[PDB]
Design an enzyme around this catalytic site. Structure first.
Site, short mmCIF file in Angstrom:
data_model
loop_
_atom_site.label_atom_id
_atom_site.label_comp_id
_atom_site.label_asym_id
_atom_site.label_seq_id
_atom_site.Cartn_x
_atom_site.Cartn_y
_atom_site.Cartn_z
CB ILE A 54 3.73 -2.79 -5.54
CG1 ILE A 54 5.23 -3.07 -6.19
CG2 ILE A 54 3.78 -1.61 -4.69
CD1 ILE A 54 6.00 -2.04 -6.53
CD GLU A 92 4.95 -4.62 -15.46
OE1 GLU A 92 3.67 -4.01 -15.51
OE2 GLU A 92 5.14 -5.83 -15.55
NE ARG A 125 3.94 -8.74 -13.10
CZ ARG A 125 3.40 -7.74 -12.46
NH1 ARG A 125 3.80 -6.67 -13.08
NH2 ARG A 125 2.64 -7.82 -11.64
N1 LIG Z 1 0.57 -2.18 -8.28
C1 LIG Z 1 1.37 -2.93 -9.33
N2 LIG Z 1 2.17 -3.98 -8.88
C2 LIG Z 1 2.75 -4.37 -9.91
N3 LIG Z 1 2.34 -4.73 -11.34
C3 LIG Z 1 1.58 -3.82 -11.58
N4 LIG Z 1 0.88 -3.45 -12.69
C4 LIG Z 1 -0.01 -2.61 -12.68
N5 LIG Z 1 -0.03 -2.15 -11.29
C5 LIG Z 1 0.94 -2.90 -10.78
#
Ligand SMILES: Nc1ncnc2[nH]cnc12
Length: 247
Positions: A71, A160, A163
């Site tokens: 993001i 997350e 993923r």
């Molecule tokens: N900004 C972000 N976007 C996606 N995954 C992340 N993990 C830590 N910060 C993140």
């Protein structure tokens, strides 16, 4: 573009949303039936937009970099917000260009910075679909003091979840309740780059990692993962970060 509306949302419709987000990401190859993300894409191909609408019909648009599911920032109305980092300054040349105001947040988008700014660690911040509604409202009516914790809800509910199947399933179960994430969720979030790298190495090394990854399982045991026949590789991790995209 991918959309998710919280009004009338079910476990099923969150699953459809996270499927569509994974499908929006370009992949070079599959390794062990898991999409391997691209190492480099032109700016015109690099970003995807996610539209999120809360219970009160207030919508934000979130820009993600499709090579690493990061993001970059979000738009609410006529104002865009970007993280204070190099990749986000690059992103702002391509997305939300017709926003009247652009705000640069006083931090980067990594967890150690966001947890310091929120004054709260990931384990103590509620997740679930009602917590995502709250996060959207907080970010739409940007309150500087509450933004960092809301951005951690947003990241965990979109990036997350994309993923890992386990994280998707845990958040999607909680439709009218909230929950605190276990160390199993925290260790998966922490270990995505390392697991990705080792699965790429394993494909040239008969399915064996060069360096083991230590995860925490559902019983809060440290487990040492050494190959592609482990459950986290066979039936959990849903996207791989390219080895060229780790720095
Ligand atoms: N900004 C972000 N976007 C996606 N995954 C992340 N993990 C830590 N910060 C993140």
């Amino acid at each position: 573009d991918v959309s998710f509306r919280l009004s009338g949302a079910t476990s099923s419709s969150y699953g459809v949303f996270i499927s569509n987000l994974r499908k929006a990401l370009p992949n070079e190859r599959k390794l062990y039936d898991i999409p391997l993300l691209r190492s480099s894409l032109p700016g015109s191909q690099r970003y995807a937009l996610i539209h999120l609408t809360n219970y009160a019909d207030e919508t934000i648009s979130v820009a993600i970099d499709v090579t690493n599911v990061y993001i970059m920032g979000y738009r609410a109305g006529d104002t865009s917000y970007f993280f204070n980092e190099a990749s986000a300054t690059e992103a702002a040349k391509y997305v939300f260009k017709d926003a009247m105001r652009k705000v640069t947040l006083p931090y980067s988008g990594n967890y150690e910075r966001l947890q310091t700014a929120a004054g709260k660690i990931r384990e103590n911040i509620p997740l679930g679909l009602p917590a995502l509604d709250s996060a959207i409202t907080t970010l739409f009516y940007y309150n500087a003091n509450s933004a960092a914790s809301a951005l951690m809800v947003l990241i965990q509910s979109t990036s997350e979840a994309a993923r890992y199947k386990f994280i998707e399933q845990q958040i999607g179960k909680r439709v009218d309740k909230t929950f605190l994430p276990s160390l199993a969720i925290i260790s998966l979030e922490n270990s995505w780059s390392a697991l990705s790298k080792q699965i790429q190495i394993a494909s040239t090394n008969n399915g064996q990692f060069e360096s083991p990854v230590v995860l925490i399982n559902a019983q809060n045991q440290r487990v040492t993962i050494t190959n592609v026949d482990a459950g986290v590789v066979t039936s959990n991790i849903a996207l791989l970060l390219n080895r060229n995209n780790m720095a």
